[PDB]
């Protein structure tokens, strides 16, 4: 009973860890169906269900399970469990766009972790809280940098939280956590218009990504670095990083990222006046969007091509893609 509930839960946890959350989830549900009198165990099952559903993009279900975990942690007086549940609720509320409540929940995680002198919990909570402010500021209007004071206020609060997180994970020797904070700090600086600061942080993220052999993180960092250099007016440097993202996108067989690399390269070459290089990268993007059935990107390819040919002289091909742009 209590024993086989635990046995099912362990198997659920094994499966999620190995990348099979679909299968692990239903072992968690079976565990709940069998049930147990150990409320610490039951709480942890609910939390792992919330985590599994979050990773499966069922945020509504994730929220409900974290809420049960939180409440149960309170009934038994488990402060550590209460703090972790509050952190998980906050991360979920953030994805759902409940930024105000996300802040409260993540602050609770932080406050309890400090009350208990749990430094690992404290660092996580600072990262999470930074993420909420980051997402909040990022949610305004047009994406990218430039509008309402609250945008800047939220992003600046995220910078302060990431900097404090980074200070703490350095003292803990947590390299992976440093990479994560550097990454998010860099994008936070980017959105604030602090482009030189974005570059410094993304370079650190890059270094740590290479250290772990984390190819996805490496790709992100190059892409983010390219973006920052575009806004610095250093277009040659951007093409370099955009090219490095392109290499890894191909090596990792990630077609969508492969397509975007080509489009941003086409635009960097447009800003560098090399219109022939622009066309080449645009048609490789156009083809890839036709492959992935992405109609929105397919439209952008046509419009960009028309503009480049116009600065070259080719009036005939400029009209050809304009008629293809109207169709989509």
């Amino acid at each position: 009973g209590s024993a086989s509930c635990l046995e099912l839960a362990l198997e659920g946890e094994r499966l999620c860890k190995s990348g099979d959350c679909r299968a692990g989830v239903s072992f968690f549900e079976a565990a709940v169906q069998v049930g147990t009198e150990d409320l610490k165990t039951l709480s942890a099952i609910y939390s792992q269900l919330g985590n599994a559903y979050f990773y499966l993009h069922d945020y509504a279900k994730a929220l409900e399970y974290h809420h049960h975990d939180l409440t149960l942690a309170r009934t038994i007086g488990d402060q550590l469990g209460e703090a972790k549940a509050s952190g998980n609720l906050g991360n979920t509320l953030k994805v759902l766009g409940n930024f105000d409540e996300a802040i409260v929940c993540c602050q609770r995680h932080l406050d309890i972790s400090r009350e208990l002198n749990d430094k690992v919990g404290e660092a996580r909570a600072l990262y999470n809280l930074g993420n909420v402010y980051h997402a909040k500021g990022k949610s305004f209007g047009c994406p990218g940098p430039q509008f309402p004071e609250d945008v800047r206020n939220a992003l600046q609060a995220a910078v302060d939280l990431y900097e404090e997180n980074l200070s703490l994970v350095t003292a803990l020797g947590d390299r992976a956590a440093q990479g994560r904070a550097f990454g998010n700090l860099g994008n936070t600086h980017y959105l604030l218009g602090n482009f030189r600061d974005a570059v410094i942080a993304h370079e650190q993220r890059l270094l740590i990504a290479k250290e772990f052999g984390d190819k996805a993180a490496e790709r992100r960092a190059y892409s983010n670095l390219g973006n920052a250099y575009i806004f610095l007016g250093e277009f040659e440097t951007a093409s370099e990083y955009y090219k490095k993202t392109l290499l890894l996108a191909r090596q990792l067989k990630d077609r969508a990222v492969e397509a975007q690399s080509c489009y941003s390269l086409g635009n960097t070459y447009t800003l560098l006046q090399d219109y022939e290089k622009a066309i080449d990268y645009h048609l490789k993007h156009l083809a890839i969007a036709q492959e992935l059935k992405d109609r929105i990107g397919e439209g952008r390819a046509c419009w960009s091509l028309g503009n480049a040919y116009t600065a070259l002289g080719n009036h005939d091909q400029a009209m050809h893609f304009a008629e293809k742009h109207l169709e989509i």
Partner: peptide, 22 residues
């Protein structure tokens, strides 16, 4: 110009040993 999704850090879950540590 359009640059795609900003490429933020994916969400991080370091807690798949909880039940096993209980």
């Amino acid at each position: 110009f359009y640059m795609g999704t900003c490429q933020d850090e994916p969400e991080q879950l370091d807690d798949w040993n909880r039940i096993a540590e209980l």
